[PDB]
Design a protein around this ligand. Structure first.
Ligand SMILES: [K+]
Ligand SMILES: [K+]
Ligand SMILES: [K+]
Ligand SMILES: [K+]
Ligand SMILES: [K+]
Ligand SMILES: [K+]
Ligand SMILES: [K+]
Ligand SMILES: [Mg+2]
Ligand SMILES: [Mg+2]
Ligand SMILES: [Mg+2]
Ligand SMILES: [Mg+2]
Ligand SMILES: [Mg+2]
Ligand SMILES: [Mg+2]
Ligand SMILES: [Mg+2]
Ligand SMILES: [Mg+2]
Ligand SMILES: [Mg+2]
Ligand SMILES: [Mg+2]
Ligand SMILES: [Mg+2]
Ligand SMILES: [Mg+2]
Ligand SMILES: [Mg+2]
Ligand SMILES: [Mg+2]
Ligand SMILES: [Mg+2]
Ligand SMILES: [Mg+2]
Ligand SMILES: [Mg+2]
Ligand SMILES: [Mg+2]
Ligand SMILES: [Mg+2]
Ligand SMILES: [Mg+2]
Ligand SMILES: [Mg+2]
Ligand SMILES: [Mg+2]
Ligand SMILES: [Mg+2]
Ligand SMILES: [Mg+2]
Ligand SMILES: [Mg+2]
Ligand SMILES: [Mg+2]
Ligand SMILES: [Mg+2]
Ligand SMILES: [Mg+2]
Ligand SMILES: [Mg+2]
Ligand SMILES: [Mg+2]
Ligand SMILES: [Mg+2]
Ligand SMILES: [Mg+2]
Ligand SMILES: [Mg+2]
Ligand SMILES: [Mg+2]
Lengths: 73, 119, 88, 101
RNA sequence: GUGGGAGAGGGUGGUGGAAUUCCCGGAGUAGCGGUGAAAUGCGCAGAUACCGGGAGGAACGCCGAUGGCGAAGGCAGCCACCUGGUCCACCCGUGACGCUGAGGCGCGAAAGCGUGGGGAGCAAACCGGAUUAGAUACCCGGGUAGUCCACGCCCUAAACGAUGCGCGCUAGGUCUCUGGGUCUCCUGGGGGCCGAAGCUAACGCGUUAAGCGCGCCGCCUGGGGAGUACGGCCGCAAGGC
């Protein structure tokens, strides 16, 4: 499960610490606004730990969703 | 007497019962149904079949208002959720979309003892 | 916090000779800096215990160093205390 | 002195007079609290992921500054005085941490 | 000492969204809820289901781990400030300044105590409904203390790795968190698993010893009587030692 393809593998060279950048960070969330696990994000321990902080920041700023409605169930 | 013809269908499903509320696009209720609305009384309200009957009832009462197509919003996880969706699809109402809105907190309130080992 | 300039200010003050960062004088002076600042931090934040342990440890260290000094060269010890304004 | 980043989210409904008034107040606050402005990026109106004060949009200002630490929080408090200011977030600035490089 | 690193370590202030309850309005009607099945309960003074607006308390989903930090208790939304410990590199300074530690002092989950505040959800006690031969319980509906904040007490625990602290010595393999380097690898600091020698009553332990050694502290001496009696110390009490 969660094996489909590698969120990190397809993406450019980006700053993991940038909360203002949205369009890149969007790819680290599921259909719901939940933060994808390492299985998906493909990141490393430190990378993931930083991503979490960043995403949460952008959430508070209102640039990223806390929660999203699941469609076609 | 309304003549809405475009609407939303809220399916609220628990293990004890199923309630279907059909409303206008602004969310204001038109008609509603449930396991208890139909003949069922006891635990049989939680039954998938009872859910079907409820959905169908709500759909008929809706088409009485000239309703045609709805957007389904599903809240709750329990038996007869998917059956209610099914009945709605087969009800003659065109189902445009189905969405799961089921409420979850982020460790908000202490659940009662039955629901514990969680928060 | 303790800025680099303050720390050099105190180190070059107590140094036995040019370039001495390690003498008992320098160590005890530095410890006294940290202890004082930590106590100042603990006058408010009375409920911060985990730092207070730190304070106990620092005081213990300073006391052992000073005991060593007074055992070795009582003159430099008297001088150190007269300087820093230790004891009480 | 330390380097921070000030995120300001304002009300998108404002016209030029009110917006520029908010800007003036913001920069007067920044100067009065002793912050020196290094770089500023104004993104402006952008669609929020969730409604803030019932508005689907918001106006975005960003100020990279250098200011005394002891006053930082106070500055933020001041920035939050006005009604037209929806959000204020001051972040200690950090060096970029990349991936796929 | 200098230059860097990781972290739910601690304290103060600020702030975010989800959910629950309650209040107000709209729309809407005959039930909702709950169980093994039910009933009590709530609902025509309009509930449940749905939309909008408001009030409040409490806890932080995903990330989240087999992970990290702390001396222990324990620590998890985000932001800033104050602050403890620790790791690495350089090989610069001091020159045995070390270890352990009876008493002492401090910290110490939960429950509990005192004064005041707060109180959404949960909920000892209690009140009801069921179940049973009986049900003083288990299941359901209510519900006070309490749970929350401040200040001051209380000192306990399966406070557990049921494994005192420090140093040296004795094959490796593998996974992992975090440093540094001549980066496939090498070299540090942690966390796991399998295992040399060896040890163990066995189970198992095995460079994170329960192996080989040295230093210092605490403790044990068949079961019940009994953590009782007596005395003392501490505590407002409960009670603790
Ligand atoms: K530090
Ligand atoms: K009492
Ligand atoms: K014990
Ligand atoms: K490296
Ligand atoms: K066993
Ligand atoms: K006694
Ligand atoms: K007494
Ligand atoms: Mg919502
Ligand atoms: Mg039922
Ligand atoms: Mg620093
Ligand atoms: Mg890298
Ligand atoms: Mg922390
Ligand atoms: Mg807080
Ligand atoms: Mg809310
Ligand atoms: Mg109402
Ligand atoms: Mg009537
Ligand atoms: Mg209230
Ligand atoms: Mg630190
Ligand atoms: Mg040397
Ligand atoms: Mg010499
Ligand atoms: Mg000791
Ligand atoms: Mg206690
Ligand atoms: Mg307590
Ligand atoms: Mg009390
Ligand atoms: Mg009280
Ligand atoms: Mg009162
Ligand atoms: Mg209750
Ligand atoms: Mg009960
Ligand atoms: Mg009582
Ligand atoms: Mg005992
Ligand atoms: Mg244990
Ligand atoms: Mg290791
Ligand atoms: Mg063997
Ligand atoms: Mg083994
Ligand atoms: Mg004993
Ligand atoms: Mg004895
Ligand atoms: Mg005996
Ligand atoms: Mg005997
Ligand atoms: Mg005994
Ligand atoms: Mg005993
Ligand atoms: Mg005992």
């Amino acid at each position: 499960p969660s094996r489909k393809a590698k969120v990190k593998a397809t993406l450019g060279e980006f700053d993991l610490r940038d909360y203002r950048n949205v369009e890149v960070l969007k790819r680290f969330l599921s259909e719901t606004g939940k933060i994808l696990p390492r299985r998906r994000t493909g990141l490393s321990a430190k990378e993931q730990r930083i991503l979490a902080k960043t995403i949460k920041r952008a959430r508070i700023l209102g640039l990223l969703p806390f929660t999203e409605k699941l469609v076609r169930k | 007497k309304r003549q809405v013809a475009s609407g939303r269908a809220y399916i609220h499903a628990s293990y004890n019962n199923t309630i279907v509320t059909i409303t206008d696009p602004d969310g204001n209720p038109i008609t509603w149904s449930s396991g208890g609305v139909i003949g069922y009384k006891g635990s049989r309200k939680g039954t998938p079949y009872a859910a079907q009957l409820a959905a169908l009832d709500a759909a008929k009462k809706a088409m009485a208002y000239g309703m045609q197509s709805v957007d389904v919003i599903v809240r709750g996880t329990g038996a007869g959720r998917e059956q209610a969706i099914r009945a709605l699809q087969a009800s003659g109402l065109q189902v445009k979309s189905i969405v799961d809105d089921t409420p979850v907190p982020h460790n908000g309130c202490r659940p009662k003892k039955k629901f514990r080992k969680a928060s | 916090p303790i800025t680099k300039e303050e720390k050099q200010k105190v180190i070059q003050e107590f140094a036995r000779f040019p370039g001495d960062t390690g003498s008992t004088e320098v160590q005890v002076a530095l410890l006294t800096l940290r202890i004082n600042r930590l106590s100042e931090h603990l006058k408010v934040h009375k409920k911060d215990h985990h730092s207070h342990r730190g304070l106990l440890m620092m005081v213990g260290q300073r006391r052992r160093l000073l005991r060593y000094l007074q055992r070795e060269d009582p003159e430099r010890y008297r001088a150190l205390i007269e300087k820093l304004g230790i004891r009480g | 002195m330390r380097r921070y980043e000030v995120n300001i989210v304002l009300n998108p409904n404002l016209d030029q007079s009110q917006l520029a008034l908010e800007k003036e107040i913001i920069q007067r606050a920044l100067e009065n609290y002793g912050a020196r402005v290094e770089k500023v990026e104004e993104l402006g109106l952008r669609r929020l992921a969730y409604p803030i004060a019932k508005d689907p949009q918001g106006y975005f200002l960003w100020y990279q500054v250098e200011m005394p630490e002891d006053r930082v929080n106070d500055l933020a408090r001041e920035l939050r005085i006005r009604d037209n200011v929806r959000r204020v977030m001051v972040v200690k600035s950090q060096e970029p941490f990349l991936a796929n490089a």
